[PDB]
């Protein structure tokens, strides 16, 4: 059983004995501050809401627990094991914290309130900042939202472009990270991140997050298609590759099938197995069971630009109404190798320049998608704003002198629509002038309670491009 | 409740239709294949043998959860759910594979098999690799605790040509990475490969996950101290930061404190009011109980030379017996912003180029030490190199034109010493020739048990650096 207790930096453990002396409250907010990445995603406080903080969190057991384990790890009693029986003896172990929160899958620019904290009981000043940590790990899901909708954009910018319209986007950038992530929670969490903007994903895992602390009206959010690895090819011997393609092809002759084919020579087996011994199972297929060419090796671009090269030599090019070439319908290629938002975008530029349609490809991405991502990205932080002390409010910050960029917000803060259809954060209780229409930030959490959720349908509404909405 | 049926890569589902038709076996192994990181900690398979892999995995339920999960996610029936009722109905729901493995905790070179999975039931030749996801994911706390391992190295280095010897070198890497992580399961697997290379981590989740998998003599693997952050002193108001010192020490006399310092002015706080207004406070503290400061911004070593300069300026400096100049044994730095294995070792160098001791300082590490890292640092890989099909068996491998770093192992494989002690790993059988000695790999599971382990102790010991070795002997 998870213990909440347990669940912060062993340092904001010893915190409840630095605040200032009679200190009633204490009020923090989260943003992703300022400094590429203008606008970010706000997507994964409601799972992190519903799984660790709502509810009976605090038993005598776990008090008991975090007391013995404390000991031993500062090797001296400093936990405040009081205050934890206070919120277990008269809220039957209910956290009185209220948390506000923009909704889930709104596009926010940097340097926003996005959520901000406090407690509702004086005697629980220091459990604001104790579940900071708790709070702090929603920088994953924002950041792969926001990583992954930055891809869409560019891939959307060039299908558009090539193609005339954004058929096919949603299905145009899978994720593959499964294996690349570094746990099974993290694999979860970030696949539903990453379904915020896209349909394709293997990482099973966040199917049953979204199930369970979102919801959709669609049986599933996300979709896959029959594939090979390596060893699904390899296991034939290296002289029976065309046997391997052949039996894969003929199995899955009715779906879209995706096989790797650079297992010992890419540009042989588009050219030689694809394209003459095994051109006539190719040429058969169905519009709607197409067979997809995955190189996994060399550089992207160049692997790409010549896989592209070989079969337009070997098989039916067309040219689309903006002048750029089309496989026909029953082939396909997805590049899954070396894919990040850098090389995505180096590649759909190399393909434009040679007149190739983005209709003919998609991306896999794996590692790049969902583990080279940090906090330090889009400089996500929880800082205290306000307290109060003496029954006197004051207005809080940190103000750095060697960098500029660290300083945080002042006091009471609200996220607002400015007139021409920006975004503000008004500081220092000035929302309260009430000058700028109505604070988007709701209490999404209060005593215990999840106030207000969100469904992963609306997340995704909230979440679309501009060009989709034109 | 975890299924393992749903801990796959979609893909993998169709593969028991792609094989060969009669396979028998299917034999992979896992590398951190050859392409700064020469030798990696092989640590972490443990966990995850006990916690997905051993036991009752497979139930009625869990077969009918993931049937109508895939036929919605493929929108086609192609659940292998007549392999998976086998499984259940012949073993009891119990893995028919069996995975050798180095011992946890050695230091391996580059391109060596560090684990190997094979089916032992012929029905189950799909079943490998199936749990080739949830096994690749052990590249994570090997990569952490090889990473980790490395600043460790260089800290020893700096720290032994400075004070003549390694004292206090386990609490110089400090783990601060739990908000910094991508979850709370990371944050425990994460703060445990560190945990195998030093002492200290606030990621309290380490701890438990040490004692439930792997066990160590004492209470806890990991240790910490009382520590200020921001909001504790600037709640205090702008004017009031020197009543936020004051109390901070005050309330943590006897043991050791932490304060942050750069709230306002870094340079100030160090000056005038530790080095002026509070210095009475500071230098009656115990040698036990240091006031650790602790400076959070500005260029990493520019920050951490100035803070000390004026220390030394406040407070009595000595020199110690290698000429190094060495604050009071009341007070130290901790400097926890930027660093990663590269500003690490910048800070080091420029330090004992100004003549300071690394014994003046610590270092904290967060998203450094836990989340900037990918499975593309040590190449960490799966594959598979031997099937038997019709009787048959045969050495498989992928050898991509483009890439030559991208070739495979071919056949069943060992682990070996050489003869002047080093790794070898043998290929094609061939160490069944018995040319240099027994394989290093165990058996650490087969048909559902674990069945070799390794406590958490015995890791840190395999781990160890050479020097430390050297300075033991
Ligand atoms: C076969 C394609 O399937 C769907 O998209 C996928 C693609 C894809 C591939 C190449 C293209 O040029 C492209 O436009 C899309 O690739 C996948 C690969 C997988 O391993 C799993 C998937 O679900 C898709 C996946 O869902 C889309 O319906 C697409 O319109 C159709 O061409
Ligand atoms: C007060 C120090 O505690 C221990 O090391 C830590 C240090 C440290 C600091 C400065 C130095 O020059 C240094 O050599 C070490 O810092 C910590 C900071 C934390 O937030 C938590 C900790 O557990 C330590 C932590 O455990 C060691 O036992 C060291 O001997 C002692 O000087
Ligand atoms: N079926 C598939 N379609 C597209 N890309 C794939 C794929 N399977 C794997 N990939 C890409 O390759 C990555 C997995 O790497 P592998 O383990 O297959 C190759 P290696 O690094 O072990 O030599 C994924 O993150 C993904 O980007
Ligand atoms: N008590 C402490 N001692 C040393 N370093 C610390 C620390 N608390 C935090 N840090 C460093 O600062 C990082 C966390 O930064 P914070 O979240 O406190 C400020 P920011 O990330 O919003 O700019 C940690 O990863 C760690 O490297």
């Known amino acids: ?17 630095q605040y200032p002396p009679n200190t009633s409250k204490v009020y923090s907010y989260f943003e992703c ?31 008991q627990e975090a007391k013995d384990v404390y000991k031993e790890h500062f090797q001296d009693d400093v936990f405040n094991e009081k205050g934890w029986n206070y919120i277990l003896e008269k809220y039957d172990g209910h956290l009185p914290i209220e948390i506000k929160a923009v909704p889930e899958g709104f596009v926010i620019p940097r340097g926003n309130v996005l959520f901000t904290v406090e407690n509702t009981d004086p005697e629980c000043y220091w459990l604001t900042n104790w579940i900071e940590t708790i709070l702090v790990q929603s920088w994953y899901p924002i950041t792969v939202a926001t990583n992954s909708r930055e891809q869409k954009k560019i891939l959307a910018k060039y299908l558009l472009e090539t193609s005339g319209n954004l058929d096919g986007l949603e299905y145009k950038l899978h994720d593959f990270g499964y294996r690349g992530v570094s746990s099974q929670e993290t694999a979860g969490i970030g696949a539903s991140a990453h379904l915020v903007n896209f349909k394709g994903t293997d990482t099973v895992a966040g199917l049953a ?45 009715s779906v879209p099938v995706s096989v790797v084919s650079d297992s010992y020579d890419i ?92 209709e003919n490809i998609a991306f896999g991405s794996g590692g790049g998608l969902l583990q080279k991502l940090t906090r330090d990205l889009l400089n996500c932080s929880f800082k205290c704003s306000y307290v109060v002390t003496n029954g006197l409010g004051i207005n809080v910050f940190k103000d750095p002198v060697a960098d500029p960029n660290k300083r945080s917000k002042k006091g009471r803060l609200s996220l607002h629509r400015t007139p021409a259809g920006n975004f503000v954060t008004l500081e220092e209780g000035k929302g309260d002038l009430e000058e700028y229409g109505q604070d988007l930030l709701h209490t999404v959490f209060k005593n215990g309670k999840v106030t207000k959720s969100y469904s992963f349908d609306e997340i995704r509404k909230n979440a679309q491009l501009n060009i989709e909405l034109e």
């Open 267 to 358: 540009y042989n087996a588009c050219e030689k197995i694809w394209g003459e011994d095994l051109r006539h199972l190719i040429v058969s297929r169905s519009t709607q069971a197409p067979l997809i060419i995955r190189p996994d090796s060399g550089n992207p671009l160049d692997t790409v630009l010549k896989v592209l090269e070989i079969l337009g030599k070997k098989f039916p090019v067309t040219e689309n109404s903006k002048g750029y070439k089309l496989l026909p319908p029953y082939l396909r290629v997805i590049q899954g190798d070396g894919v990040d938002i850098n090389t995505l975008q180096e590649i759909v530029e190399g393909m434009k320049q040679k007149m190739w349609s983005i």
């Open 33 to 63: 501050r300022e400094k590429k990445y203008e606008e970010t995603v706000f997507y994964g406080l409601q799972y992190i809401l519903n799984k660790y903080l709502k509810g009976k969190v605090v038993t005598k057991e776990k008090i």
């Open 1 to 17: 059983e998870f213990n909440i207790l347990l669940a912060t930096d062993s340092y904001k453990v010893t915190h409840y004995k």
């Open 209 to 253: 997050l979204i199930k369970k602390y979102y919801g959709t009206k669609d049986p599933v959010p996300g979709y896959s298609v029959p594939a090979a690895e390596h060893s699904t090819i390899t296991a034939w011997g290296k002289d029976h590759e065309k046997d391997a393609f052949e039996h894969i092809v003929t199995q899955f002759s």
